[PDB]
């Protein structure tokens, strides 16, 4: 099935805009490009490719692609130095597996601090400031901060700020023997979170929908969330802004970064066409804008178009928190790690475990991450 | 509803079971249907959610803990008089969170199997085995070959001096407390690693190799379970089945598998199923019927086991089972086996020392084979 391009992308992306780029590529080359948005595409792709079928190009979060590459399902991509120079260097980091590039970065996503400009026109630059801020707001019938404490993705930026990390990352490789989740930095960040809860500035039970409800009805001055939340805040009419996360111990909060990426199916007989399409049609200002026009990509990896889009301070902030954070590791071990950390944060925040006990357990999981 | 549907595996005496079912019909008018679907153990948890599934399911006890965790088995209710009819240790196999969730039927474990021609008096101790091997090597033979690749076979020696899997207390297994790197576990694995270094055994021996050598009269001894007997019968080798060797004067401790009969939580026939199992199956004539069709080996019923154990091979199965431990009925055991399997391969091959291989199996880290996909 040579001579064409079949592309899979998720249904919450601008697939109709990507279809217009496919139509331009066909006008110029005569090669037909078909864009599909299957349900469950990231589960379906290894099922169909592993028997040398599937699309020629697949778009998904970079972290799943480690999995695919481990199974030999993705081609090494081959952009020259001049092409790689057009994207932010930290993005190339996300699409490396065994020192080889395995996908093109497209867009970048990370948490930011979202604030209610009517309640809080000058938001805090530091975590250490938030308790006093909370006191002032509580006197007005409001609170300083609510965010999801049930999922450790949302709490991680504070945990990593003073030096906590998941898996040491050096020379383009994760050392899974070297876990940083119980080091002195991680303990200090988590102890700060636990103290906030002990001191009634936050509630251990708060989850994604409680925090979103409070922010969007103007009951709390701040929340921590990502660009997937903006359109709900737009519906609410809150006058919000989006900014840099606070520092802790004078160091930046470090959210994990998700890189929407495009990989080439190892079994495609159309690898050269895929490279030309991605490098010369999609990853240019005109190509990304065709997609963005349809549904906003957020912050993008291509520097020239990101600079254009970053006139929107919300998008500038996303990129700013992303460059201060770290790439989500693309290794299969992350899912056991996230399960152990999630228990750790819940147990420390409830009083069930101390911070030191909780985190030692996350670093040294034993059999704890084999469910059920 | 007003019937019983039973699932049992095709390798068991299902025709013998269907005959017990007929006897139940004659007495009660209740039709009993015995089915042997393929992968019944994977099907059961699927269909006991479409309300469907058999009234009774026969399977190894260790898969039952998973079913009980999901609420798929009823609590069974034998009186104490009935409980007294079965070996006490078999009831321990079918407890989940304090509650009895199946009736035990039969018991299986590894024994030491020996060629009476080469070795009329088998060693009582592992410690004896190197001098024995030297004697046989001088004759073109070997003392001992068994499957070294699967740690179910090496476990009896590891556990002899103190090795344990998950600590077991107040009727549950504690997945946070692992006993495979204690001094006992290190002593026995070191013994086994030394037998390899000293060339009494070969690190590459697997199930096939060991079976072919014992069955061709090439090695005096092997370690295997009742499922291997019929191939040895065919080979015509003159064999005995006996107690495993002791290590540091303590019995080897193999893991025990108990075939058990569970009642579906969603059955409207739980009372019929209880009278069927208690008063028709778990009797001398009920078990006899099944056993005639395919042998049960060692059974849980005290009165019938006394009869079967005048076969010394079945006596040895039960002896070794009573010296061993019930296989943990938790889903973590597959991971435990994957981690121990690697540790023994690595210790055996010098890729790791015993101390480090077992440390890794007791407390797996993110580097562990259990958290890989590959
Ligand atoms: Mg070029």
Curated annotation (Swiss-Prot), chain A:
Localization, per the record, is: Periplasm
Any single Gene Ontology cellular-component annotation: membrane
The stated induction of this gene product is: Induced by maltose and the transcriptional regulator MalT. Permanently repressed by cold shock in a PNPase-dependent fashion.
Question: Pfam families, from UniProt?
Answer: SBP_bac_1
User: One GO BP annotation here?
Assistant: maltodextrin transmembrane transport
Sorted alphabetically, which InterPro entries does this protein's record hold? Maltose/Cyclodextrin-bd (IPR006060), SBP (IPR006059), SBP_1_CS (IPR006061)
Describe its partners and assembly state.
The complex is composed of two ATP-binding proteins (MalK), two transmembrane proteins (MalG and MalF) and a solute-binding protein (MalE).
Role summary? Part of the ABC transporter complex MalEFGK involved in maltose/maltodextrin import. Binds maltose and higher maltodextrins such as maltotriose.
Question: What PANTHER family does the database record attribute to this sequence?
Answer: MALTOSE-BINDING PERIPLASMIC PROTEIN, MALTOSE_MALTODEXTRIN-BINDING PERIPLASMIC PROTEIN
Q: What NCBIfam families does the database record attribute to this sequence?
A: PRK09474.1 (NF007011)
Q: Which family does it belong to?
A: Belongs to the bacterial solute-binding protein 1 family.
In Swiss-Prot or TrEMBL terms, this protein is called Maltose/maltodextrin-binding periplasmic protein
